[PDB]
Amino acid sequence: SPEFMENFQKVEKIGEGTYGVVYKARNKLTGEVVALKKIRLVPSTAIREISLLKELNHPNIVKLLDVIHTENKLYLVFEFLHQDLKKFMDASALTGIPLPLIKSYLFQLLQGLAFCHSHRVLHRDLKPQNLLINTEGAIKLADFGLARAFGVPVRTEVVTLWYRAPEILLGCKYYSTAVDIWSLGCIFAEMVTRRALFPGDSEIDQLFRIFRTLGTPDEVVWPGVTSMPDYKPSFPKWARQDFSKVVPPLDEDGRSLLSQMLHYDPNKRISAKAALAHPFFQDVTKPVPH
Ligand SMILES: O=S(=O)(O)c1cccc2cccc(Nc3ccc(Cl)cc3)c12
Ligand SMILES: O=S(=O)(O)c1cccc2cccc(Nc3ccc(Cl)cc3)c12
């Protein structure tokens, strides 16, 4: 103490992220491998949200070990992890992730989200590449979306659209913790089917792909939807599709949970805390990935 960037030896780039390149590095003093994020350099609400995220200590949130300030630079020192759910799904495309691991990962992500949400922290940008996994079966939240959400002046892609809740796409100013449950519901479906649920290429295309699968919402399904800032009565009217077609492998317990996570109305969408008690998790275990 203090640590300096000279105390770290770069090993390899371990991928990109909302802040560009992440590096595997080695502490020359201790031998510990870590993951380093470089942030090139803030609104008052943004400082406060960063402080809230720094407060969080949880098994399912990637552990921040240190923050090193040098001139224009911030170097975030994290625990070393180097697999993520997107890379794991791609390597498992031939066979699919086994259901006990799907259940375990979904359960843990709900635990991490429940913890964030009770501390007034939202993720806002949940996607499979932001979800880090280790050898012992844990999965962890990372690359929180607060820089673009709170106008942080830091350098920071259609993949982000695929997991965006419909109340965001329709312009809602004061969205809620429910946006994270939507994203996780999409990831749940994607683990099961081995394909992204709503891979749109623009905000309107994302909306139309959602509508084509879940039905065009109306006031009966989603009170207030037709007055949302970007709602247009010219939207096409699609009927809802059966989950036997949308997520063929799921049974009624899985379809029940997924339908509650993808509820149009954010006020009716299941909370993270409540989803942990869903019957789907009756037999949840902690398997190790291969
Ligand atoms: O609070 S920090 O622990 O430094 C911090 C931790 C992680 C990410 C951060 C992203 C943006 C600004 C941060 N803070 C900060 C405060 C003062 C100065 Cl002069 C420069 C930067 C971040
Ligand atoms: O990188 S993260 O994986 O999102 C992350 C994960 C876990 C704890 C974090 C604690 C404080 C800041 C984090 N990140 C961050 C980076 C840049 C900005 Cl401007 C704002 C926030 C944390």
Q: How many CB atoms lie within 10 A of CB 180?
A: 30
Which ligand is in closest contact with the Cα of 121? 2
- Active-site residues, by number, are 125
Name 98's Cβ contacts closer than 8 Å, sequence gap at least 6.
Answer: 287
The DSSP result for 104-160, as a single string, is: HHHHHHHHHHHHHHHTT-------GGGEEE-TTS-EEE-S-SHHHHTT-SS---GGG
Answer whether 4's CB lies under 8 Å from 68's CB: yes
Cα distances (Å, whole numbers) of residue 73 to 38, 39, 123, 166, 219: 7, 6, 24, 36, 49
Place of tokens 């975030």: 76
**Which residue type is seen at 42?**
V
**Which residue type is seen at 125?**
D
Residue from 36, 42, 74, 156 to probe ligand 1 pocket by mutation (most atoms less than 8 Å from CB) = 74
**Which residue type is seen at 92?**
S
Minimum CA distance residue for ligand 2 atom 19:
147
Torsion of CA 51, 56, 60, 63, to 10 degrees: 70
Q: What resolution does the deposited structure have, in angstroms?
A: 1.8
Q: State both tokens at 94.
A: 């031939």
Identify which of 54, 73, 49, 51 has the alpha carbon closest to the alpha carbon of residue 65.
54
Identify which of 283, 274, 45, 8 has the alpha carbon closest to the alpha carbon of residue 147.
45
Identify which of 71, 27, 196 has the alpha carbon closest to the alpha carbon of residue 127.
196
Q: State both tokens at 133.
A: 């996994």
Which residues contribute to the annotated binding site for Mg(2+)? Answer: 130, 143
What domains, with CATH codes, occur in the chain?
5-78 (3.30.200.20), 83-281 (1.10.510.10)
Question: Exposure of 174 by Cβ count < 10 A (0-12 exposed, 13-18 middle, 19+ buried)?
Answer: exposed
